[PDB]
Design a protein around this ligand. Structure first.
Ligand code: 6OU
Ligand code: 6OU
Ligand code: A8W
Ligand code: A8W
Ligand code: A1AIB
Lengths: 562, 275
């Protein structure tokens, strides 16, 4: 009995043993040669590898305190599989996964662990195979469960796991970035149901949401079927998304009207509205960070800072506040400070790109731009190397008598078309500049055509995958907007006030269903493999050889009998 | 044509007849042309205002030839590609605006520090001139910042142009991969459309309507037998082809070998006992 066999001392000895086929180095980095490894350190390194905002049942201070002070793991298979994947023992991990509770959750964790170990660190080989194999197994298990029962598969996809720090399968898949799992039909159906919220409407959803936002009192009553109806309509994430979009458009229009016209000693009403917008957004950001409690206050910001867009937003807010402060510093400083928050507008116009990835037909363009930014960066070096040489040569040939005056960069970088063409059309002094002009003119068009071809190839390569990639971001967007309150950014100031004012048989059935699903998967795999033509041909050949040999031997007996 | 579209009675005949978009557009164009003609004969003040309407109306008639240019083998792919790329251009417009308008507004705000709205800023922001911006490219910071803005705008313009080129190339390739197959379908519609129509041209069918008003089982059994024979032959051929498949034959041979080997092994014991 593994349950009876399992014990703290035995597991510690197993972990600390070196009699077998990167655990030591990784533990040392996370944490002393031949140091006695305990469950606490193993859990700590596990949490390190999983990522931020994660937890492990064994990897906790209370568990460490208990260990320091039955002693049987209720689910030994989980720890055994975690160890097996930790020490890079694949067949044993497969066997353990063959018999275990909540196999899908463990499989996704293994895929996450394999990828994380590969990135931290044969390393390439295991990354390509081990992590991919675990992900494929999870996908196959999901597919079988959906075939057996759609409702039960949907229920299994989302439910709190006490063992794994209460993280659903979807969250683990997203953390592992396994696009295949999310792309499955059941996952997309669940995401669409979540996005539509309580309302079941599925035809002309955008127009219906726009009408509901425009005409609450009349639209909401009818839209509820497709009081409490208005409240549940508001709480849906889609209407929140449209509300935020409209508020952002209004903010953009006010910002355009403010900076573009005039300035006075005291700001106008529109500038006050914009300042209120930014103040409320800052309050919302601070609240969101505050609710990001896991890891305590000190270790909450570190995880929250992973996203780049959030950091850019903070930087933009700081620059806007600095510009506003400088504005109210008399005319000499007002004129100097206006430009800063005039330039600040650029960030807000570009922030819509991160929101333009939601649409099916719009995200490919953003992905292509992101891909081609680096290509343009590299192309710039070649462009400079080619053009600057000829420009410098042409400039040197002309203006034989000259003084630096820090004014040659403009002359070399001018690169005019009409002027060069005219310059194209004693004798040698005229011939050489013509040759230089012709070479520059040819090089310009050569580079232009090269850039065109580069962009075409990059766009084709991006488009070959953008459709598959698009589906992943939907879960992030939906889980992001769903958590956010219902009021727009300028009106959530009251929302915070309301927030402050406010302050087992099914499990057994699911376990049985999972066991049945895995048994059926193994049976189907074995039957399909045994029914393969290649295997059957081999079996027939071996049987024929033995049958022929027996017949030949029997022939001698028949002759002797006669 | 609507009158002869009798099925569904008078009330339910228009509903079906209205499915085609081109017919509705034709009706709209006819109504606008008639309105413009009526306005034309309303003295000079209304004649000058009504002429423009039926001047603009010409655009529809020039574009109606596209629905007739799909017949040709080599001409329909272009129309299909245009129809496909219309939506792509619609989506591209949003990105173009989002990118360009920000820089344009920033540049406009940096310049003209003292200004009044006068409902005349859209032209300034949307001007987007090439030569003027290039000249503007080439105390110190006030000169540096506009140069940076101009350079960014100049780079963005060509980036967007190349992006549009790539998008159009990809869309054209995808359309051309299927246009040849698609073209054949429209021929039946065109043929059954023109066949029903009378012989005179549109301006002369006025007499055609006058002429119209003036005017006002063994084979079945053989066909049934042929169909029955065809379906029987199809089933027979399907069964024969499936049974002749290598995969099926290998399985059959393997099963027979196993049974034959088992019988031989059992017979061996009988032979030994007999001896
Ligand atoms: C057309 C005229 C001017 C526009 C072209 C811009 C200059 C590019 C040509 C120079 C060049 O890179 O060719 C190089 C030779 O340059 C010249 O001889 C000139 C290639 O050098 P390689 O050793 O023969 O082979 C290495 C392969 N990369
Ligand atoms: C070259 C200069 C200007 C022409 C380019 C026009 C601006 C496009 C670049 C801005 C941009 O979209 O990059 C975005 C970053 O923008 C900047 O930092 C600048 C990408 O944001 P991300 O979060 O790092 O990744 C999301 C992937 N889409
Ligand atoms: C590729 C080029 O052609 C560039 C690259 C480096 C540039 C140089 C940088 C340093 C200075 C010092 C300055 O003296 S000063 O009194 O005006 O400050 C005069 C201008 C001068 C000589 C630049 C001339 C142009 C460059 C050679
Ligand atoms: C992105 C932009 O820059 C555009 C978008 C919305 C436009 C504004 C719409 C409303 C009006 C009212 C008008 O007052 S009036 O007496 O002339 O009628 C002056 C012009 C003004 C301020 C426009 C300025 C330009 C915009 C800010
Ligand atoms: C389109 C579109 C824009 C957008 N902008 C926001 O939603 C919101 C915001 C509000 C006012 C000004 C600037 C941005 N902002 C950015 C992204 C999501 C988010 C999350 C928490 C707190 C703020 C915030 N949403 O759709």
């Amino acid at each position: 009995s593994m349950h009876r066999f399992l014990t703290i001392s035995r597991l510690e000895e197993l972990y600390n043993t070196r009699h077998g086929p990167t655990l030591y180095h990784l533990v040392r980095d996370v944490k002393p040669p031949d140091y006695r490894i305990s469950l606490i350190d193993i859990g700590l390194v596990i949490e390190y590898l999983m990522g931020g905002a994660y937890r492990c049942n064994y990897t906790r201070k209370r568990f460490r305190t208990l260990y320091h002070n039955i002693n049987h793991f209720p689910f030994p298979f989980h720890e055994l599989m975690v160890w097996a994947v930790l020490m890079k023992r694949q067949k044993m991990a497969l066997f353990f996964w063959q018999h275990g509770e909540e196999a899908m959750a463990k499989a996704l964790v293994a895929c996450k662990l394999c990828k994380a170990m590969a990135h931290e660190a044969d390393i390439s080989q295991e990354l390509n195979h081990n992590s991919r194999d675990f992900g494929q197994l999870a996908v196959e298990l999901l597919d079988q469960s959906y075939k057996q029962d759609e409702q039960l598969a949907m229920k299994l996809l989302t439910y709190e796991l006490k063992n794994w720090s209460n993280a659903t399968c979807l969250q683990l898949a997203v953390a592992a970035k396994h696009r295949d799992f999310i792309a499955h039909t059941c996952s997309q159906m669940l995401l669409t149901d979540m996005w539509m919220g309580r309302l079941r409407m599925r035809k002309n959803s955008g127009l219906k949401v726009i009408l509901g936002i425009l005409l609450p009192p009349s639209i909401l009553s009818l839209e509820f079927k497709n009081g409490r109806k208005i409240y549940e309509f508001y709480n849906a994430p889609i209407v929140k998304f449209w509300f935020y979009t409209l508020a952002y458009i209004g903010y953009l229009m006010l910002f355009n009207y403010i900076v573009l016209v005039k300035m006075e000693r005291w700001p106008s009403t529109q500038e006050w509205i914009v300042i209120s917008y930014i103040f409320t957004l800052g309050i919302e950001k601070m609240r969101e960070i505050l609710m990001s409690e896991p890891g305590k206050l000190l270790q909450k910001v570190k995880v929250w800072l992973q996203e780049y867009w959030n950091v850019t937003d903070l930087i933009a807010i700081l620059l806007f506040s600095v510009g506003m402060i400088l504005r109210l510093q008399d005319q000499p400083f007002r004129s100097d400070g206006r430009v800063i928050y005039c330039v600040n507008i650029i960030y807000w116009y570009i922030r819509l790109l991160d929101i333009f990835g939601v649409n099916k037909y719009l995200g490919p363009y953003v992905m292509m731009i992101g891909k081609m930014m680096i290509d343009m960066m590299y192309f710039v070096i070649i462009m400079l190397v080619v053009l600057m040489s000829f420009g410098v040569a042409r400039q040197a040939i002309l203006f034989p008598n000259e003084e630096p005056s820090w004014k040659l960069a403009k002359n070399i970088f001018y690169m005019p078309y009409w002027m060069i063409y005219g310059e194209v059309f004693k004798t040698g002094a005229w011939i050489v500049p013509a040759i230089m002009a012709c070479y520059l003119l040819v090089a310009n068009i050569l580079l232009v055509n090269l850039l065109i071809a580069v962009f075409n190839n990059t766009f084709f390569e991006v488009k070959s995958i953008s459709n598959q990639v698009w589906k992943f971001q939907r879960y992030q967007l939906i889980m992001t907007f769903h958590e956010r309150p219902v009021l727009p950014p300028p009106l959530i100031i009251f929302s915070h006030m309301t927030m402050i004012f406010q302050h087992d048989d099914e499990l057994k059935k699911v376990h049985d269903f999972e066991e049945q699903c895995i048994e059926e998967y193994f049976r189907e795999k074995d039957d399909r493999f045994n029914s393969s033509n290649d295997e059957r041909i081999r079996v027939t050949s071996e049987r024929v050889e033995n049958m022929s040999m027996r017949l030949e031997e029997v022939n001698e007996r028949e002759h002797s009998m006669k």
